[PDB]
Amino acid sequence: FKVINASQQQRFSYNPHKMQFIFVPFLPDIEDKVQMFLTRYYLTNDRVMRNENSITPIKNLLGRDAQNFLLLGLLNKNFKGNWSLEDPSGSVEIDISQTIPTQGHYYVPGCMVLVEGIYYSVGNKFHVTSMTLPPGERREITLETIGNLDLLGIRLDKDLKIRLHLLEKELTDHKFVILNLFLDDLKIMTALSKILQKLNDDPPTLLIWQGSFTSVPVFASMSSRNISSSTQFKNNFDALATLLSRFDNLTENTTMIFIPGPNDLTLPQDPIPSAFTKKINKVCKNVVWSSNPTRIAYLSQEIVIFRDDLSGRFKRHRLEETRKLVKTILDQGHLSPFLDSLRPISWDLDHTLTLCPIPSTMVLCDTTSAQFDLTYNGCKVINPGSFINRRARYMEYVPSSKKTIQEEIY
């Protein structure tokens, strides 16, 4: 039972002939960039093969001139209306002129989909019957076909220990606390005062401090107050550490986790530096600084935490709600199904963002949708929503019974 370090995690590469991963383990390489999407295509390929209306490459159809296939590819774009599609065997412009597809989750670019139709080589523009997304299977059969290795950290698989589930179903002593959170307002101080008031009595176990610790970003340019974004943020930490030290009931038996948001000093992202967490590391002894995103090494489960604006980007890019969002992220099996010219993902840690296999719980702290918790093929996906303008609301999750309770003060 630990917290997985993204900068210190392993790496696994897939082989289609052996259908398995190899012992892979500063700046990345070119091969990483190429094999990034290559690994994506072959992973989706094998994922399709696990589900056994046929299979055909682009070169097979372009070699002909007549027809009739459900092609696989990325909804990319070269020119206006020149929505091209690419597999590792050729490129082809596709059109959806007067198409009545299904009611998919959220069709977005940079996504590998399946479209049926005919070529019509006179203009060589493939037509679409219906656009569909690659289906995602349950975690049971998924973990059945992964093989016999370790994908979370313990190397083979030995999860046949009923004592794990029994002790978790009995030791209710380990509770998770989830609260956007700024630091330079009296309202924040008040909220934290009543929150810790609820926390000094009942000892929690794992604190999850969300991102966006400041209303403003970095890149300071005015030395009016003889300060900068760094110094201001440092003093904000000092104030938080002082309120934290006002009540020493905490850190006695509760572990904490910081998570950097989008406005602190491009994915993935290393945590808040030690130079700004010096005093809190001195006062406390149960601190950690995980990258965004990260995974909690839970003894029998795969919980992943990722804070970003998911709903705020899908609506600004569809061609022509909450379950649509969750359905999209789980079916594509990836956290950022977006082009690299849109969200620059670091070449080294693309595997970290990969949802191979299906995780147990994805903590998606959205900053533009309400708080919820729903199920979709088993993985209970949550959202705590905002924290201040929603009249001070927060969440508490039970891992054993998987209970989800909301707690509001106003």
In Å, how far from its chain's centre is CA 57?
Answer: 31
In Å, how far from its chain's centre is CA 286?
Answer: 25
29, 199, 224, 254, 384 from 177: Cα distances, Å: 39, 10, 39, 10, 11
If we measure between CA atoms, which residue out of 46, 216, 231 comes closest to residue 145? Answer: 46
Cβ-contact 316, 109 below 8 angstroms? no
- Cα radius of gyration (the chain): 24
Report the distance separating Cα 189 and Cα 52, nearest Å: 57
In words, the CATH class of domain 149-408 is alpha beta
Residues 221-234 as b/e (b if ≥16 CB within 10 A, e otherwise) read eeeeeeeebeebbb
Identify the helix (H) or strand (E) that includes residue 4: strand 2-4
Instruction: Delimit the domains of the chain by residue range.
Output: 58-132, 149-408
In words, the CATH class of domain 58-132 is mainly beta
Return the residue matching tokens 């850190």. 251
Strands (E), 96-138: 112-117, 126-127, 131-132
Q: Would you state the structure tokens that stand for residue 326, as one six-digit string?
A: 């969750």
If we measure between CA atoms, which residue out of 157, 212, 140 comes closest to residue 180? Answer: 212
Report the distance separating Cα 254 and Cα 275, nearest Å: 23
Identify the helix (H) or strand (E) that includes residue 22: strand 20-23
Phi, psi of 162 (to 5 degrees): -70, -20
Return the residue matching tokens 């589930």. 165
Neighbouring-strand partners of residue 132: 114
Other beta carbons within 10 angstroms of residue 246's beta carbon come to 10
If we measure between CA atoms, which residue out of 149, 169, 187 comes closest to residue 10? Answer: 149
Neighbouring-strand partners of residue 257: 208
Query: Resolution of the experimental model in angstroms, please?
Result: 4.4
Task: Write the DSSP assignment of 41-82 as a string of letters.
Answer: HHHHHHHHHTT------HHHHHTSS---EEEEEE---SBTTB
Q: Treating both helix axes as pointing N-terminal to C-terminal, what angle do 186-201 and 229-245 enclose, rounded to 10 degrees? A: 30
Report the distance separating Cα 256 and Cα 212, nearest Å: 17
Report the distance separating Cα 118 and Cα 66, nearest Å: 8
Q: Would you state the structure tokens that stand for residue 69, as one six-digit string?
A: 């296939």
Cβ-contact 179, 211 below 8 angstroms? no
If we measure between CA atoms, which residue out of 50, 83, 85 comes closest to residue 69? Answer: 85
Residue 244 sits at the vertex; the CA angle it makes with 212 and 187, to the nearest 5 degrees, is 55
How was this entry determined? cryo-EM
Report the DSSP pairing between strands 12-15 and 206-209: unpaired
Q: Would you state the structure tokens that stand for residue 136, as one six-digit string?
A: 């995602």
Report the DSSP pairing between strands 206-209 and 176-178: parallel
Report the distance separating Cα 312 and Cα 292, nearest Å: 18
Length of the chain measured in residues? 410
In Å, how far from its chain's centre is CA 245?
Answer: 33
**Residues 386/318/142/295 CA torsion (nearest 10 deg):** -30
Residues 136-155 as b/e (b if ≥16 CB within 10 A, e otherwise) read beebeebeeeeeeeebbeee
CB proximity list for 231: less than 8 A, separation 6 or greater: none
CB proximity list for 160: less than 8 A, separation 6 or greater: none
SS3 91: strand
CB proximity list for 151: less than 8 A, separation 6 or greater: 12, 302, 356, 357
Q: Which residues does a chain break follow in the chain (C to N more than 2.5 Å)?
A: 25, 52, 67, 154, 179, 265, 320
Report the distance separating Cα 143 and Cα 164, nearest Å: 18
Residues 255-277 as b/e (b if ≥16 CB within 10 A, e otherwise) read bbbbbbbebbeebbbebbeeebb
If we measure between CA atoms, which residue out of 387, 351, 376 comes closest to residue 39? Answer: 351
Q: Would you state the structure tokens that stand for residue 119, as one six-digit string?
A: 């070529």
Identify the helix (H) or strand (E) that includes residue 241: helix 229-245
Return the residue matching tokens 């977005």. 108
Other beta carbons within 10 angstroms of residue 64's beta carbon come to 10
Other beta carbons within 10 angstroms of residue 250's beta carbon come to 20
